GROMACS .gro file of C-alpha atoms in nm:
model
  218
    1UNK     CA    1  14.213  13.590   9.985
    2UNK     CA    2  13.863  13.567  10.115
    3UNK     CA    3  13.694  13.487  10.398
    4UNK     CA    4  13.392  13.154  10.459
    5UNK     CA    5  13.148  13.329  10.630
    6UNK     CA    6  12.865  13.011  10.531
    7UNK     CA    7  12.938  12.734  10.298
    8UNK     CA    8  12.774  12.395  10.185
    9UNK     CA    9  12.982  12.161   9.959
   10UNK     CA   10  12.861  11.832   9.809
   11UNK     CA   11  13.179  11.703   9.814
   12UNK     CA   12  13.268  11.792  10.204
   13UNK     CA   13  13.176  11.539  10.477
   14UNK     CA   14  12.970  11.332  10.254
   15UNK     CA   15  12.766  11.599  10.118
   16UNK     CA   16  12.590  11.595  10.471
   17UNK     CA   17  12.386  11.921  10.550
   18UNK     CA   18  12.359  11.882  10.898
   19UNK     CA   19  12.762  11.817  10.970
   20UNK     CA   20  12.783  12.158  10.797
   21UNK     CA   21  12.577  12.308  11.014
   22UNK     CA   22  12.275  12.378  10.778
   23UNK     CA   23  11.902  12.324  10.947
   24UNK     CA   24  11.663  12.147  10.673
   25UNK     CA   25  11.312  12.110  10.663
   26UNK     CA   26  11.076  11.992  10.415
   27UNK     CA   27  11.134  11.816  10.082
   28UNK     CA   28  11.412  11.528  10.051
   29UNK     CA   29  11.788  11.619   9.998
   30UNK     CA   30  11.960  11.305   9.839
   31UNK     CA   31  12.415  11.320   9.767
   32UNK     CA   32  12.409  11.180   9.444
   33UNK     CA   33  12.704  11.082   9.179
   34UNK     CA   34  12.752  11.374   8.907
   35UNK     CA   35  13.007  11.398   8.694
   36UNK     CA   36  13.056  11.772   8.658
   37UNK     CA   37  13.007  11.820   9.024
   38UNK     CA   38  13.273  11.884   9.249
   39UNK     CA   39  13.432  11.584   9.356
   40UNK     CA   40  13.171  11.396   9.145
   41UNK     CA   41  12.880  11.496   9.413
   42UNK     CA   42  12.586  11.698   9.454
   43UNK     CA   43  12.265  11.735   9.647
   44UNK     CA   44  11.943  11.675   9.466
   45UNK     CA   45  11.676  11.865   9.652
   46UNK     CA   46  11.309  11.779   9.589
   47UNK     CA   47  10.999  11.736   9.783
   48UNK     CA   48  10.604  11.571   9.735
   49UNK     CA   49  10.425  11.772   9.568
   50UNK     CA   50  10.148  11.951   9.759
   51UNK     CA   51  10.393  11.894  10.058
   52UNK     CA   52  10.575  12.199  10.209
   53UNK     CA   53  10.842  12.322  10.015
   54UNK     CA   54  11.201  12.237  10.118
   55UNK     CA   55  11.422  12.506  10.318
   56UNK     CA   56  11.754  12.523  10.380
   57UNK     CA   57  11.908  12.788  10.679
   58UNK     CA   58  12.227  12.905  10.785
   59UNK     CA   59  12.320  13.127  11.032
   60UNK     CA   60  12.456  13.392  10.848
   61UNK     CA   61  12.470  13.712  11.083
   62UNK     CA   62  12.363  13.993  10.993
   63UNK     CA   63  12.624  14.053  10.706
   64UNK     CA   64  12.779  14.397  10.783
   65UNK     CA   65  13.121  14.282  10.746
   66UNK     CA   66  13.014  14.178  10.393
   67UNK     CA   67  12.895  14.526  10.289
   68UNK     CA   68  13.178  14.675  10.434
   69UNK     CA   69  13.435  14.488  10.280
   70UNK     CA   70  13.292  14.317   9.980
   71UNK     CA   71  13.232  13.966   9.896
   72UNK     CA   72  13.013  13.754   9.700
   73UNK     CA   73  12.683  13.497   9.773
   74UNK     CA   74  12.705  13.217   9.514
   75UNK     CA   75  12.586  12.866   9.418
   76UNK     CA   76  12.653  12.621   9.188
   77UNK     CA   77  12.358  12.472   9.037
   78UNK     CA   78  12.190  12.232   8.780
   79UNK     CA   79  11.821  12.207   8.746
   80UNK     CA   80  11.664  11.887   8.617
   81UNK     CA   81  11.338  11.835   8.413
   82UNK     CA   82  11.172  12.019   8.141
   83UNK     CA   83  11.096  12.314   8.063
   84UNK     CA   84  10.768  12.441   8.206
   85UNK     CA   85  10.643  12.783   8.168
   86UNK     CA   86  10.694  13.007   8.487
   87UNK     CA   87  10.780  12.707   8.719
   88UNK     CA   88  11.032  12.776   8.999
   89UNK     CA   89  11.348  12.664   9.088
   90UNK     CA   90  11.466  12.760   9.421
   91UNK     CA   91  11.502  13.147   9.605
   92UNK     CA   92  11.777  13.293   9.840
   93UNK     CA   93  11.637  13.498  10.119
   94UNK     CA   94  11.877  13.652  10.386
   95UNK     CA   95  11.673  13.906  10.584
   96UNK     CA   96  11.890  14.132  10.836
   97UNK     CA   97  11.843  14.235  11.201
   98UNK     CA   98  12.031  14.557  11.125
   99UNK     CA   99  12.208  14.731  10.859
  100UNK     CA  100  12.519  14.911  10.943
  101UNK     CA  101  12.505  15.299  11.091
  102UNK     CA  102  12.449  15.543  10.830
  103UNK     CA  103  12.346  15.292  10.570
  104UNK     CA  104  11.921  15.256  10.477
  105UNK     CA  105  11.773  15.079  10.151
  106UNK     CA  106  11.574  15.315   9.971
  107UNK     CA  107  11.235  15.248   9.850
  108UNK     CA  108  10.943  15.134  10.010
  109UNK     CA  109  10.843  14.741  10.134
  110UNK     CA  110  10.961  14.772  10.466
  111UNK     CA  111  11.198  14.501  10.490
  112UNK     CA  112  11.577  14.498  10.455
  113UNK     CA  113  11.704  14.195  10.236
  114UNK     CA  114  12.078  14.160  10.130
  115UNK     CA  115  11.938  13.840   9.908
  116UNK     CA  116  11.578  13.812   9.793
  117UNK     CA  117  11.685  13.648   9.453
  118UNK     CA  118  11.502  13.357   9.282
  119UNK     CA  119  11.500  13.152   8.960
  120UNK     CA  120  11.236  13.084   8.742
  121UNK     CA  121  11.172  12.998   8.396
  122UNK     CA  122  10.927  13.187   8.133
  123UNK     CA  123  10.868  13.000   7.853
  124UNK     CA  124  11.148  12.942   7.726
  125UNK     CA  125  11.506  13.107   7.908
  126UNK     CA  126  11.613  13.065   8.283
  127UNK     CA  127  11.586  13.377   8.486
  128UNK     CA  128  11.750  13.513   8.800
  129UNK     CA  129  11.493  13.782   8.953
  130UNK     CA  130  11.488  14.014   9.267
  131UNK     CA  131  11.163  13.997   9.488
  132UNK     CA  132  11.165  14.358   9.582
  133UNK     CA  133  10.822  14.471   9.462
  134UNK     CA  134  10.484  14.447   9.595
  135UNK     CA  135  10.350  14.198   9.311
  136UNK     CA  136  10.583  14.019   9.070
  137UNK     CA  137  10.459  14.171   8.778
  138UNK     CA  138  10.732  14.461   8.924
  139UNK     CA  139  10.980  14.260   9.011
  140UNK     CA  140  11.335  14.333   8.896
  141UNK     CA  141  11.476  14.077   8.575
  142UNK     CA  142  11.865  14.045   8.721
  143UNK     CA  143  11.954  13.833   8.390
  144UNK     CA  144  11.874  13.523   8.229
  145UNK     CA  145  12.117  13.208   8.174
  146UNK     CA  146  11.960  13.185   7.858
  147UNK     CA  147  11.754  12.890   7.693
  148UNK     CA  148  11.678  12.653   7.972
  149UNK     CA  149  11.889  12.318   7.977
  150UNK     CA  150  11.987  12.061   8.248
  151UNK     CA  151  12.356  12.181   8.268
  152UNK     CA  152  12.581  12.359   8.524
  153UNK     CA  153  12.502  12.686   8.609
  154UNK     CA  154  12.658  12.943   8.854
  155UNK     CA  155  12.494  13.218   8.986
  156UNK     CA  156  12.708  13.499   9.270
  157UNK     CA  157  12.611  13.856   9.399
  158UNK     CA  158  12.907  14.039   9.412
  159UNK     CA  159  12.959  14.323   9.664
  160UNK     CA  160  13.173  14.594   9.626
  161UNK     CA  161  13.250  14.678   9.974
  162UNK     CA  162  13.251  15.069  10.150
  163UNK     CA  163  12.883  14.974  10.247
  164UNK     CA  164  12.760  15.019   9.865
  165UNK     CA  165  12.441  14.835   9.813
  166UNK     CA  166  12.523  14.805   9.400
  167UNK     CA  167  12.564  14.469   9.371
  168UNK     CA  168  12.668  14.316   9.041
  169UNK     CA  169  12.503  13.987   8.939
  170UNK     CA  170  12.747  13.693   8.848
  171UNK     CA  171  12.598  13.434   8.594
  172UNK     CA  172  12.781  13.133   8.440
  173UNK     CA  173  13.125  13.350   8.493
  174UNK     CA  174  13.025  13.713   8.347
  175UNK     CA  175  12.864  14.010   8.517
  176UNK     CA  176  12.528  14.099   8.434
  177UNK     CA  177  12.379  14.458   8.523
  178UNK     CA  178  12.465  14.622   8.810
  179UNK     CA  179  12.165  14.681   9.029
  180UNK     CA  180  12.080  14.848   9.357
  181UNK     CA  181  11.898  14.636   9.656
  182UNK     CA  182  11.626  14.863   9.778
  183UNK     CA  183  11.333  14.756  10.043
  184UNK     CA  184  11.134  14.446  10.018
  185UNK     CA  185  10.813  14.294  10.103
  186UNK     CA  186  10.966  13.963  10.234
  187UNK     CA  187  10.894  13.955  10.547
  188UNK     CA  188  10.833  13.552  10.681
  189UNK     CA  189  11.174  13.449  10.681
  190UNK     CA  190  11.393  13.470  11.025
  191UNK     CA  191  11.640  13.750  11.029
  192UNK     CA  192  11.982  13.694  10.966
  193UNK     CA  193  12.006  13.331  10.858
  194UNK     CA  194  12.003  13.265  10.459
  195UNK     CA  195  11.688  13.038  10.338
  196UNK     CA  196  11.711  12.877  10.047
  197UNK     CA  197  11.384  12.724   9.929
  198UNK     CA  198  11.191  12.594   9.649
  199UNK     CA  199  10.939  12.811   9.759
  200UNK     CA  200  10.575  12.726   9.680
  201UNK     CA  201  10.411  12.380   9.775
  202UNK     CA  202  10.307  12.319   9.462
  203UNK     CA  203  10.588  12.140   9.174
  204UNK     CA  204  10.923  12.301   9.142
  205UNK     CA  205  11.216  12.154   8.977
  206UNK     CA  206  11.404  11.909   9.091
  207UNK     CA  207  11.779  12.084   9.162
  208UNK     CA  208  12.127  11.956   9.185
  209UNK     CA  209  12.383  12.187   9.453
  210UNK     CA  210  12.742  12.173   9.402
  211UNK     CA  211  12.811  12.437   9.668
  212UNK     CA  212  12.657  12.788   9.810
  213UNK     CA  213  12.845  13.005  10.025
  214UNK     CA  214  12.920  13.378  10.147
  215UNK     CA  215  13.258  13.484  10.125
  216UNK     CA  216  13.356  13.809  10.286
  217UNK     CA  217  13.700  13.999  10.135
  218UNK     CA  218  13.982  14.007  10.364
   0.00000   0.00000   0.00000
């Protein structure tokens, strides 16, 4: 089977982020009782507005066994509230050090990203975007979980392996499109740790975690 290479889990020690080895700033992160969560848990992440946005970190590495073997990035998720036109739920950003020798995204941006995904709703669905153009306008549409609710939601990246960089989005259990990562402008987030964040200061949703990880194939 696979590999861990990062995981949080409601459910394991309590739900606490630091035991886990996650670094937290910003915002409030709160295990709470769910009844579709694993083990009846999640984290509900959600901050003040006008306050800094919440960020969680791991120290991921730079990820080169992942695009050499193959794996996946996923979370488990349930957003909470209603629906708002273009407001934000959280983004994954895992900027890298390094990518392997022999291996360069195209395009331009000047930054090498093997996550710069976030979810947002329009006026009406959920959407999973990539963050690798200059202004949003440009930015890539990965898929949509459709009308926006409060349920369960998952979300992975899957990677093929032999250093492709066509990864196939997961959502709620069936591929979406395969797409290609290419450069980024994302630049303010530490290399080779995954952030997870609400993003902007101003209101996001309030978000239930089950569980991210990165699992590598073996």
């Amino acid at each position: 089977g696979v590999t861990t290479l990062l995981s949080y889990l409601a459910s394991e020690s309590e739900g606490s982020l630091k035991v886990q080895g996650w670094s937290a700033s910003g915002g409030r992160a709160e295990v709470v009782s769910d009844a579709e969560g694993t083990g009846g848990k999640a984290v509900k992440l959600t901050k003040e507005a006008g306050k800094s946005s919440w960020v969680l970190e791991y120290a991921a590495g730079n990820g080169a066994a992942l695009l050499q073997k193959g794996g996946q990035i996923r979370c488990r998720f349930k957003v909470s509230g209603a629906l708002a036109a273009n407001q934000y739920v959280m983004a994954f950003y895992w900027p890298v050090s390094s990518l392997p020798q022999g291996v360069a995204l195209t395009g331009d941006g000047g930054n090498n990203l093997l996550a710069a995904f976030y979810i947002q709703t329009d006026a009406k669905d959920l959407n999973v975007m990539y963050h690798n153009a200059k202004v949003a306008t440009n930015n890539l549409k990965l898929g949509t979980f459709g009308a926006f609710d409060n349920e369960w939601h998952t979300l992975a990246f899957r990677f093929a392996g032999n250093n492709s960089l066509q990864v196939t989005p997961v959502i709620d259990g069936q591929d979406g499109t395969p797409f290609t990562l290419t450069q980024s402008p994302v630049s303010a987030f530490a290399a080779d740790k995954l952030h997870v964040t609400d993003i902007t200061r101003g209101a996001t949703y309030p978000v239930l975690i089950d569980s991210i990880a990165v699992e590598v194939n073996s």
